[model samples]
Target: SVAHGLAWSYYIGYLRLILPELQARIRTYNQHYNNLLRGAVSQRLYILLPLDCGVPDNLSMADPNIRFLDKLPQQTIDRAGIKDRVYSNSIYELLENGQRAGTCVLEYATPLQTLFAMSQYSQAGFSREDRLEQAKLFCRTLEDILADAPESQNNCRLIAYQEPADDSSFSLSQEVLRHLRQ
Candidate 1:
């Protein structure tokens, strides 16, 4: 099973125009906010956008403008053949005591800024062999996503690697973050 860790980065080229919730969330992650596209390569990344924290005043999932954000990932993961394996993208409802509110995990890794986000792998019973194979499936999907991407969009490529069992103490997030810095 893959360990509980994730190396990630942000690419807010222009989403800021329409998605203020993300901007606000990242800012909090930055402890008052910073960066155009900064990443915590040395630090493990787990950005939790609390359900009611700076969400748009009245923008619910009902809006057509923002509905695609929810629909796209499901389609992406489905086409990638990982609907219920390796990684699962989801939106959650946060609860406080007993009240519920909306929350989202905007876990989209670009071709150039390749990133990894995993969920409950060990408890899900993924063995080391399963980890390796699933990783391959995800990587292949990443490649396909990259090929269709325009060259003008900066960089477009996918790369995944494995470390020695002796170095397995390091979590996948730690390893990916370390490589991401390079």
Candidate 2:
């Protein structure tokens, strides 16, 4: 069994408290997550949660999932952040890598948002298909992750997000594991 929905808790300034642990565990949590997920997209998709809303609605609900950042907090507020795809190498090795890699910042950001935003009033260069394979691959990958994720007790808090109220309230839940087990 898994606590898929969420386990709610808060602090007036949990803000200061929330970060350190996530920073420590996230990479080992993700990059090491199945190892196949080698892109900023997956990182943002899993961790690096810096928003109030961005992902799909079905994936969330009242008492919203940790993988979601909604308000039990019914209110609206402005927010923003940078997805600094930051990783390290060396001064010698780091220099050239800057081009292929970089930082991005936005709120309610998603790849869909980027594609639409980047498209010019002139021409667009995005590619894709409504192929079953794409969805299957994503599910297969998630299955691997969820299978390895903890069950009830030691299950890690795998989702994070902001809110419109409670001073940008934050919450974390374990959606991947429970849903996968089902």
Candidate 3:
């Protein structure tokens, strides 16, 4: 819930958080929190809010202001084109169990970042096919989103890359962080 929210620098696309409880909290928060703009990117509705961990704990699921907004699934997120405004920043710190912990598997901006991080990664660490599928989906989603963005906003490099420890200017280990095709 909050972990997923905190892990990303910015995310504005379908209500992608699927945890039932977290989904409940977000729905409650967005319903009660009147500070943001709610709009849709097609059949998929989006709330233009950053995934900030600073959410007040005092806010409750039963807040009277809650409007019962529903969350969206992947199918909808895929169909709804990314709004030009959909962009994210680099994740400064990872949210762990009540504290800023280590980085999530990957949290970042730009296509190369994912490629760079995953290039050297071994299939032994995870389900290779799954990650590949995720990558493919992410690329397709990113493409849909970037297609709607202005060329000027879609800069050549969304984030700066550093050389790998081996001194090679490129490799998966140099480690870059969704990057969400920003």
- Cα lDDT tens digits, model 3, 1-182, are 21133223122432232121233333444456343364211111121111111122222231222222332222112224643433221112222234423221122233323333444567424344444444444444544544454431322222223333575544221121223212
lDDT of 2 by residue, 96-160 (tens): 22232211111221332333333332343323332222223333343344445332122222233
| TM-scores, each model vs. reference | 0.26, 0.21, 0.22
Clashing pairs in 3: 108-177, 108-178, 108-179, 109-179
Ranking by TM-score: 1, 3, 2
Model 1 C-alpha lDDT per residue in residues 63-123, reported as the tens digit of each score? 3222222211211123232353333233222223343222333232331122122223445
Against the true structure, candidate 2 reaches a TM-score of 0.21
lDDT for 42 in candidate 3 is 16
Clashing pairs in 1: none
Candidate numbers sorted by lDDT from highest down: 1, 3, 2
Better of 2 and 3 by lDDT: 3
Q: What lDDT is reached at residue 178 by model 3?
A: 24
Model 1 whole-model lDDT (C-alpha atoms): 0.30
Model 2: worst 10 consecutive residues (lDDT sum):
1-10
lDDT (0-100) at residue 125 of candidate 1?
61
